[PDB]
Amino acid sequence: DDYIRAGYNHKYPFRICSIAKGTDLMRFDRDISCSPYKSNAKMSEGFFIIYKTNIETYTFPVRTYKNELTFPTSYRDHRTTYFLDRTVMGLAMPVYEANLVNSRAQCYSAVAIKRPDGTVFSAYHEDNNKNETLELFPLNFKSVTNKRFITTKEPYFARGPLATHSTSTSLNCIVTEATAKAKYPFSYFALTTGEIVEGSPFFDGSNGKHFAEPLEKLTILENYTMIEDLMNGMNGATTLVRKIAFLEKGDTLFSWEIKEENESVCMLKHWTTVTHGLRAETDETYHFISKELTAAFVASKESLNLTDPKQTCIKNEFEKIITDVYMSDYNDAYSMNGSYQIFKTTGDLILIWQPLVQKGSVNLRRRRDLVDVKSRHDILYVQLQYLYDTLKDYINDALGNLAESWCLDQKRTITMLHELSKISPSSIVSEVYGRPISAQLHGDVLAISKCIEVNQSSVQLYKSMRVVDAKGVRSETMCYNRPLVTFSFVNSTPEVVLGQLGLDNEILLGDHRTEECEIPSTKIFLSGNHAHVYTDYTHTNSTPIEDIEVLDAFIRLKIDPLENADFKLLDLYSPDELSRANVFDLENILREYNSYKSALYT
Amino acid sequence: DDYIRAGYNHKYPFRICSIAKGTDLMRFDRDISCSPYKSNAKMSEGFFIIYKTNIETYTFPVRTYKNELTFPTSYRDHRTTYFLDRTVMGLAMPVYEANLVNSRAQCYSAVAIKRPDGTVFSAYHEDNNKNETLELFPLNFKSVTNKRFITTKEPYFARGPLATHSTSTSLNCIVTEATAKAKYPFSYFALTTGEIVEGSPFFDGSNGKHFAEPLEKLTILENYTMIEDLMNGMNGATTLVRKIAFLEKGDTLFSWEIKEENESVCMLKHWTTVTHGLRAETDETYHFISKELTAAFVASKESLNLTDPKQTCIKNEFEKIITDVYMSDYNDAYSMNGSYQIFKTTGDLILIWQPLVQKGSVNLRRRRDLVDVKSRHDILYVQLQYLYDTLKDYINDALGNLAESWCLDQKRTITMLHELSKISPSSIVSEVYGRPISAQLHGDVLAISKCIEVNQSSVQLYKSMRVVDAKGVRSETMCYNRPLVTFSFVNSTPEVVLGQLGLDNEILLGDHRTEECEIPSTKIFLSGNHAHVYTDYTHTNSTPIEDIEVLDAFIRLKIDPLENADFKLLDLYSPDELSRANVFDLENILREYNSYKSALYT
Amino acid sequence: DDYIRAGYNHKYPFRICSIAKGTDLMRFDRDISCSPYKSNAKMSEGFFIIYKTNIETYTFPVRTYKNELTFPTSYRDHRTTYFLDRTVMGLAMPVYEANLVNSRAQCYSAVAIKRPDGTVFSAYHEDNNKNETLELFPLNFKSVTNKRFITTKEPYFARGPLATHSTSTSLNCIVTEATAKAKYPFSYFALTTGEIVEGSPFFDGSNGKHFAEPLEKLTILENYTMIEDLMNGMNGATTLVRKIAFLEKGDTLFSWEIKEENESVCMLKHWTTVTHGLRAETDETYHFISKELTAAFVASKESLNLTDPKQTCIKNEFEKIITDVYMSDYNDAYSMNGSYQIFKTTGDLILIWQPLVQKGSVNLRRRRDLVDVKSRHDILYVQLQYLYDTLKDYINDALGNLAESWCLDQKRTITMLHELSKISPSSIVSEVYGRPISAQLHGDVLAISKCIEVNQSSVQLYKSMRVVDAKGVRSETMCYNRPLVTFSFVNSTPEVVLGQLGLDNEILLGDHRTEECEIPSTKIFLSGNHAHVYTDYTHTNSTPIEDIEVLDAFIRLKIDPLENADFKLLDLYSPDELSRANVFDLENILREYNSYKSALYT
Ligand SMILES: *[C@@H]1O[C@H](CO)[C@@H](O)[C@H](O)[C@H]1NC(C)=O
Ligand SMILES: *[C@@H]1O[C@H](CO)[C@@H](O)[C@H](O)[C@H]1NC(C)=O
Ligand SMILES: *[C@@H]1O[C@H](CO)[C@@H](O)[C@H](O)[C@H]1NC(C)=O
Ligand SMILES: *[C@H]1O[C@H](CO)[C@@H](O)[C@H](O)[C@H]1NC(C)=O
Ligand SMILES: *[C@H]1O[C@H](CO)[C@@H](O)[C@H](O)[C@H]1NC(C)=O
Ligand SMILES: *[C@H]1O[C@H](CO)[C@@H](O)[C@H](O)[C@H]1NC(C)=O
Structure with missing residues (x-):
């Protein structure tokens, strides 16, 4: 027999893609706007002072x-x-x-x-x-x-x-x-x-x-x-x-x-002053972020109004603090944009926010440090909030920049695809569409043609690429560039008609393409899942596609998912140690005294 | 002299890439499956109730x-x-x-x-x-x-x-x-x-x-x-x-x-009820996440069994709570999938988890708020765990989506590379391989040819691209498309043989390519690290490649690494303030009383 | 009339791009070095022991x-x-x-x-x-x-x-x-x-x-x-x-x-031993990270020197601990690289760091667990620091790997663009440049030509693509591949001169391109914002570009920004519950006793 049964691929099946009805014009959208990564967070510059409730007794x-x-x-x-x-x-x-x-x-x-x-x-x-x-x-x-x-x-x-x-x-x-x-x-x-x-x-x-x-x-x-x-x-x-x-x-x-209660007791005590602060406005609350303290304070959007006589004792003090802080650092590059505002953060801290406007070019820089001795940690929640805010801000910025770069790369790739489609429209349009189709350049636009399958039986390839005359004479000057393939259309029609092999298991009828023969030739044609070797325009061998190695064109993304972590509970001091840390124990003293008194019934 | 010494490039050296042995077929893997981003976390829907140990005394x-x-x-x-x-x-x-x-x-x-x-x-x-x-x-x-x-x-x-x-x-x-x-x-x-x-x-x-x-x-x-x-x-x-x-x-x-201990003392007190909760199952523990509380509770996978008479006093209460919560919100869209389970979280909190199944389309929504006054923070660890879990989930989702998009882009790029290789196989295959080689399209597959270097001396280029007849007659109708270059093979062989310049410092022997001459011509050829200008098919100038500017085809990724941060310890109240916050001090009272009694030796 | 008014596009306007002055050579930078993502963090291997201040009284x-x-x-x-x-x-x-x-x-x-x-x-x-x-x-x-x-x-x-x-x-x-x-x-x-x-x-x-x-x-x-x-x-x-x-x-x-104070009171107590630890060196402080404890300790870079007699009581104990730990796990794969160092972490914890060198191939693995009962959480700040460090490390690693992959992809895309420019230089160079220009391959380099606009009026297209002889005779063997377009240059010059339509609203004079006519032809040409249909080399219809659908070549990045979160304050025990948790209250006892004594004035 002068024919070889073809292979089969489940996603590139042998199909006939004649023009049939044609039409179905397509085009590439080269008009794409890429937005630069502008942060959506609303931030304001200024400084704030934090006041805490006074727990000291009146002596x-x-x-x-x-x-x-x-x-x-x-x-x-x-x-x-x-x-x-x-x-x-x-x-x-x-x-x-x-x-x-x-x-x-x-x-x-x-x-x-x-x-x-x-x-x-x-x-x-x-x-x-x-x-x-x-x-x-x-x-x-x-x-x-x-x-x-x-x-x-x-x-x-x-x-x-x-x-x-x-x-x-x-x-x-x-x-x-x-x-x-x-x-x-x-x-x-x-x-x-x-x-x-x-x-x-x-x-x-x-x-x-x-x-x-x-x-x-x-x-x-x-x-x-x-x-x-x-x-x-x-x-x-x-x-x-x-x-x-x-x-x-x-x-x-x-x-x-007998003194006066209003003029002798102040229920608010100054805690700290943040010279460089930022106010991040969310949809429901403000976030006052201090990088120096690594703390973020959350307060409702409604400003307070200090009116209690026992809480207005700090008014002059914090106004003087505001004046001194503004006069010291932000003397020239900034100006006081309106009056201050007083907020009550969650956790009952009085925060006095002072807005600042403008930015001059440079401003004076000052550094400070403290050597306070640690004894407890009551406000770790502000540090937790600051950690969340910082990580969220960094992640959002990084992913926004990545999205902008991705937009630019995709736009360039779309332009490149449009330029490539003018050479090999079928493969490019099939890859973009996701389904094997046929396309042809009708001037400046692509006119794709949906086309149907044929039965996978009776797919025979002639083992000779030479052009043979009607009198059984081989033409030494004309040779088919592609092997001639015979198919039986659908299985419901046992009739067999000869065609020419194309690309990615595609057949086409009409005038079979041909060119001048060359004495040295080792062409290899891919069909189904079996490569076919043609030397001197005749078949010599047929091997599976898996034999020839594969170029590693894929570029991997070495990223592994984050793992679950269980933060185990840590106890610095056992409760027994807390019990033993006191010289005087009220319960022990009272129990011993009562037992001795009861035994003193003599 | 009618020749010019060539330059040199350390990664594109002058090589002769004759077929020699040929073979070494290659192909592009267009059969790539891109998995969509399915989250690997296992989550279940339901609500849970948290009980804490009762510290109130019995009065x-x-x-x-x-x-x-x-x-x-x-x-x-x-x-x-x-x-x-x-x-x-x-x-x-x-x-x-x-x-x-x-x-x-x-x-x-x-x-x-x-x-x-x-x-x-x-x-x-x-x-x-x-x-x-x-x-x-x-x-x-x-x-x-x-x-x-x-x-x-x-x-x-x-x-x-x-x-x-x-x-x-x-x-x-x-x-x-x-x-x-x-x-x-x-x-x-x-x-x-x-x-x-x-x-x-x-x-x-x-x-x-x-x-x-x-x-x-x-x-x-x-x-x-x-x-x-x-x-x-x-x-x-x-x-x-x-x-x-x-x-x-x-x-x-x-x-x-005299009452009954079992019927008068309950050692577990209801703390809160989470109407919308999620259970994330890790490899060793469950994670109960409540978005309303911004808390995550970690418990071992083994459910408890309340049997102590002093701990079963909450059974009826929490069963009624379960019934009411199910009847209120999840009446229709969900059904109670099995009985509840009781877990003991790290930190000794009794958590009663009730699973829910199905999802109907929509469910009733209810909102609540509390105005409790802050006094301390004993359970910040659950908030820390929730923060870690939320950030990990978001990062995993974002990077998985990025990986899926990267897979799709790489697959399309591989298809585009395969289509491009049919036009200029050498450059594409060299770029993919990472090493300068030569390739040629043998039908439908690429037959690369590993080829050796030649010595960098005696690399001379003829300053005339005109085709000169054997009788020293220039052919006005035939002109070489590329300059003719002479090389001495390896330095161990001083023999010199003439060839034709190709692309990226590549030489090839045989019939030198030529075409019709054109009177206006300003062709520029790149060789080594020196561009050569050819006007009227003759050399006129030779300049370094760095002179001609470079198109900025690279697309930058404006991402900067995160910086180290040292969360400084914050103290709201100095220990002296804690000392002064109490009207009665046991140590001071006892010391003063003892000193007075000792001085009362009269 | 035998002409049709053209459309208009705001970013691809009708321009004449004659050579004019030419020059302006360009090239693609194919010499790009990518960097394997090497982490910038400096980490050292070893184990450390943590000592805490002794709060137990002397009994x-x-x-x-x-x-x-x-x-x-x-x-x-x-x-x-x-x-x-x-x-x-x-x-x-x-x-x-x-x-x-x-x-x-x-x-x-x-x-x-x-x-x-x-x-x-x-x-x-x-x-x-x-x-x-x-x-x-x-x-x-x-x-x-x-x-x-x-x-x-x-x-x-x-x-x-x-x-x-x-x-x-x-x-x-x-x-x-x-x-x-x-x-x-x-x-x-x-x-x-x-x-x-x-x-x-x-x-x-x-x-x-x-x-x-x-x-x-x-x-x-x-x-x-x-x-x-x-x-x-x-x-x-x-x-x-x-x-x-x-x-x-x-x-x-x-x-x-009467004992000796130095030999009877030790002010430092052993807390825990971390067998597998890492030291991350920042620009100002060390970070001692323990994965087992999920804790990170921050200490200044200056090592201490224990000299107080009441603090040297732990020297022999921790030296023996160091010896035992080294002898147990890191016996062979590691060797003690120098003497230990003593650091005072923030929060006043004495940390004894022992460096280890080398890595042998494998080492013994040991596991341990504790069932300690929770009573408080005083050192949650180290867990917060560990959480920040872990998340920062993971984010940095992931984004560095992404940057390396992006570099590789961009380099390959640049090579592909260089290969594509040899076929359709104008579109590729315009896309890279960002502005519509014209380029032509002058040998091995691109010689772009900046070119000017023309007025948007009098842009007429002849409705016949047939080549008509000077005697008004249509040539059945010669047909224009592109429609002939007439323009009036700038509006300041009312003169009208005929040209030929190119690509992306580009005109060019000279010998109009032509080829053999074909009886079946349905070419479509894009011009401005109106597609033109040419059947049998004559105009038949003109429709807006929006009519023909668009291939979805864009690949989306399904990433959404992280949302703001307000960690609400949680109170496990109300302050009233803390008040009721004590059998003996000093204030109540003293007040009742004083009131009774005052009423005892009989
Ligand atoms: C002295 O005290 C009396 C009340 O006892 C008061 O009326 C008077 O104004 C005071 N004068 C001065 C100078 O304080
Ligand atoms: C009353 O108390 C006695 C024990 O003193 C008990 O035996 C009896 O059953 C009780 N009766 C009622 C009605 O409580
Ligand atoms: C006994 O105590 C005395 C001091 O009272 C001291 O001088 C002497 O060295 C001690 N001897 C011994 C054996 O402890
Ligand atoms: C508070 O009172 C002041 C007048 O003392 C008034 O100007 C301000 O608008 C008031 N603000 C609120 C919230 O009541
Ligand atoms: C607990 O006891 C109940 C019976 O009261 C039994 O059904 C259940 O399986 C037991 N579970 C465990 C863990 O012992
Ligand atoms: C501490 O004292 C020891 C001698 O006991 C000395 O070797 C070491 O260098 C000193 N270090 C510092 C920081 O003073």
Whole structure:
């Protein structure tokens, strides 16, 4: 037989692509606009100041006056320990004696005791029966923050056992300087020692402030004069006080200066100042980004309006800070674009944003550093937000630039494809379309022709490319450039008609193409999945396409997907270590004391 | 001389590429499959509920009964302060008197005192010698959370100084309503005032619970009846108690209701409900992602099984929550795909995951918001995990889409290269191969030919492109399209043979190509690193290649690498500020009290 | 009329591109070097150990000795409660009695009382007038951590009421074993019960340590011998102590062993060991990355030098750890490259970095896990830094690989463009240049020609492509391949001259191109914005270009920008829950006690 059965390819099947109906003009869109990568983020330049809620307590000095009687303690004169001796109890210093102490740094020698009947008792030191004055001495060298002055060095006093205990001849006056503290509501204040006064330190006659102590014990004086410190004695400097309060609670008299709440307590404290900041406006919130702090603060778009008297105490301070910061760095290149705005970030931080306009060419640069010692991390969330914002911005910029470059490359490739289609329209148009078709250049546009398949049987190729005359004479000057192939159209039609092989398993009828024969020729034709070798315009061998190696024209993209990660929880200090880190434990102390007291039922 | 020495290029050297052996067929792989970008992550739809460990203490009401004798305090009748007067001490109220108080809101007028010998003492109010009853009054208007009822207003009592102190005629009954608290083990409970009972509040006759107090002091009653509040007096409503406990500790009697531990303490508390959640399954753990909370919870793949009686108290609650959530949002578009699963996330959070199936087309949408006030941040790790997961997902999606587009572009470029190789095979195949070679189209496949170099000396180009006859006659109708070049093969062979210049410093022997001459001609030929100008088919000038400018065909990728960042540590509040934020300091109070007591050695 | 008005395109306008001046040689740069993506990060291999500051207090045993007298408590013999009976007060045990207790586990039966006058009182148990010894008993079964031994079981003592109170005949000796704690400065130590000693536990005769207690009360002994535990009695084992301290404070005597501060307190505690670590060196700091912990530690580039005696206590431990870790995993594949370095990371963590060199081929692999219970998260910042570093590294690697692939693709595209320009130079050079120009291949280089526009009026196309002889005879063998177009040059010159249409609205004069006529012909020519159809070399129709569809040659990049995210603040436990989580509240206890004491003014 002078024919060879052809192979088969599942995506380049043997098809006849005659013009049939033709038409179906096509063209390449060379009119493509590529947009430069403009960032969609809206950013504004400026600086902002951050204020935090003040958690420090309000500390003020409190002076306490106490007068007490005590028998000689731990007496053991008689056989039965003289029944001991102890008066111990004391009473609050009277107001006039407090005035004497605050004026001349001395205290009276006599006290009055009121029995429930109403009788007034007169007690004297050593029974001298004199209402004279005694000086005060700084016992224990005034210690630290608890400077107390005393008039009696606690010596041995008069006593005598009548087989019992009966003695009280020791007058001592206790004057102590202490400091008190109060939380934010100021409903009460407590001394450092432990005494508690259930009332507002700013309470007055009609201020309406909280006060639970009995009113009759309270006493308010105006334009009072008192010595600053008792160490200096009666010659110490005296400062006028516009309003002072005297309270008699229990056995002690408490005195403190009544100040004004609005002018003495500020509930906002300056935390930090960011000289170079940016405001990123999202669809619902602002993002204040500080590269120096690596922090991003999120606040709602509605600016605040500071009106509370306890929150306007920072107005002058932050206005001066704004003026100084603007005068220092952004003096020339920028100008203050409108007034500042006050925002409340999530997490309750007061942020004062000041916009800046313009950009001059260059501006002064300043650097700073801090050596603060780490103790905790309460605001790591702003760092998390900053990390997300920075990574998102970088990724968006990189991918936008990549998209612009991709647009440019695609436009150039489209132009190149249009230029190439004028030479080999069929392959280019088939590749772009994605389906094997036939196209032909009809002037300046491509006129494709959808065409049908034929049956895969009876696909025979003549093993001679020579042109043979009608009289069975080979023409030595005419040789077919492509092998002659015979096909049976569809299987429903057993008729067989001869054609010529084209490209990518394509057949075409008509005048078979031919050219001058060449004595040396080793043409190879691809058909289906079997290469055919033609030497001297005749078939010699037929081998599978897989035998001839493949040029590695593909360019790989060495990118691997990111892997899942489980951030494991880390504990620097075990809770046992936190338990052992405190010298004093309230629960342990109370439990031990209660157990000892219960065992003390003897 | 009629010749010019050629230049040199280090990567396009003058080589002779005769066929020699030929062979070495090559082809382009146009059969490339481009996989679309399918995400490898496995995600499931549903909602989950998160439960946290309950840290709240167990609070229950405790009633205390106390009976005490006190002489008129701070007596000062006689000269020696009448040796004062103070009985002070007290004793626990007897059980029958407690019953009388709890029933008729009144207390007996007589008490019994047991001396160590065994004698029983009878003491009476005002020595009336009557065992009658007295009512209780809400002293201090019952205050807040410490409503205490008393029977004596502490008036002046009978006394008389025989130069000593001897008086005790004041019977007072103290009945107080207080609240106690206990940690999780319930080994003990302590009153708010400070009293401690070393026993389980759920202790019973044989429950086996921890109890350190002596058993003889304990007393357990059943079906006890008692008044709810003492403010209402004897007419107050009474509630039956199935089991009550009476404990006599020190000088006070404590009473509390014995409940059931399993039915009164729940160790898991509902935290939040996520209506729209996703479960990302990794190779070892599940990731529960909530976009609303911006949180990701990591739990092991093994579902739990709630069996502890103190942890099953949430079963009905969370089942009802599941039913309500499913009935509200996912009523129609989804159906409950199997039963729920319970997972324990890292960090000990109980997560109840409910799967959902299907997707109907649309579902109801609901929005919510919260105005909770920030105080701390204990679970920032879930936000960190969510941030990592979100960024990883976005990066993976973007790079997968980029890889798919790159595959498509590379496939089209390979097709274009195959089409181009049919016109200029040498350059295309050399570029793909990466090494300068020669190729020729042998029908439908390329037959490349590896070829060797020649010596770089004696590379001379004739300065005339005209074809000169054997008789020294220039042919005005035939002119060489390329300059004639002479080379000496390798330096080991000094013989010189004339050839014709090709492309990219390539030489070829044989019949030199020629065409019709043209009077106007300004052809320029590139050879080595020196362009040669040929006007009228003769050499005129020779200039370096760098003189002629270069088209900027390269398309840049404006991408810069990310920079290193050092997240600096931020401290909102200095540790000194934390120290100053507390009104009461245990260490300072104890140190001051101890110093004062040590100085009280008088 | 035999002419049709042409259309117009705003970017491909009708221009005449005659050679004019020519020149302007151009070429393609095929000499492009691409770079394999080499990472710029500098990483070193090794392992490091992390040490944290020790927050645990220093606990040591303290023995207390107390001797007290107490009358029979709660006496009620006589009618007036026998005026009660209470001596109660006590005194510090003398040093010699302490020696007797510490040696023979027994205490003397007599004590001495010194009155302020100077007299010495002799008191005895039951008035036996014997200075004998008594044993100690472990009261309350020694409890836990408060083992106390007593000699008196607190029985009834001798007493008698003479209408008053007079009795003291109960000698009791209190010996207690307690534990004390101290913070870092060691300025003071406090017992667990609550007693405070204002002095350094390491104080000595001349150590210079802080000590506020009076020196005369202190007593230091050397080579002291004492029983370890009092439970064993007089037969208990005794351990020599090189130095012991006896302090008499108040009514109690305190004894503790004086150790050496340098050899007993270590201020650095081992936290974790990272067997596989990496050190990333930035421009200013090192980054120590541990994949196992998912943590990155940032430290300055200057290595420390441990010299403090209280910080060198870890030297041997961490050197042994280094040796063991190297011997275990990196025994063969790696060698210790130099000595270790000590860094102080931000956050005050001591990091001991050990470099490793080489890589052998494979090394042993070991895995570990921990089941620690979560209680807090203090070091989340290292996890944040690790997350940033990991994401930055991955993004940099991916984008570098993408850049390298882009370089390769661009180089191949440039080669392809150079090959294509030899066929259709005008379109390729115009696309690369970005502006419509004309180019022509002058041998091996392109000689472009900048050319000017012409007026958009009088652009007429002849509706016949047939070549007509000068005698008005159509040539059936010659037909123009392109339509003949007439233009009026610029509008300032109304003269009209006929030309031939080219490509992309280009005109050219000279000998109009022509070829053999074909009976079937349906050529379509694009001009301006109107396609023209030519059948049988004559015009038939003119339609807009938008009518013919467009091949979708563009390849999209399905990438969408990342969206802004607001990480909302999450609170696991409300501050009210933190308030309710404590059984004991110092503020509430103090307020209630103070209110009760104030109401106790009776
Ligand atoms: C002094 O105080 C009185 C109120 O006690 C006040 O009325 C008066 O204006 C004050 N004068 C000065 C100078 O402060
Ligand atoms: C009442 O309490 C007793 C136990 O004291 C119990 O046996 C009885 O069943 C209870 N009856 C009711 C109705 O509660
Ligand atoms: C015993 O202690 C004394 C100091 O009291 C010291 O001088 C002596 O060297 C010590 N000897 C031994 C063996 O410890
Ligand atoms: C706040 O009050 C000021 C006047 O003190 C007013 O000018 C401003 O518009 C107010 N802003 C808001 C939000 O109420
Ligand atoms: C838990 O117990 C239940 C029965 O109460 C059983 O059905 C389930 O399989 C058990 N699961 C595990 C992990 O033990
Ligand atoms: C620290 O001291 C050691 C000697 O003990 C010395 O060798 C080293 O160079 C010193 N390093 C620094 C930073 O001072």
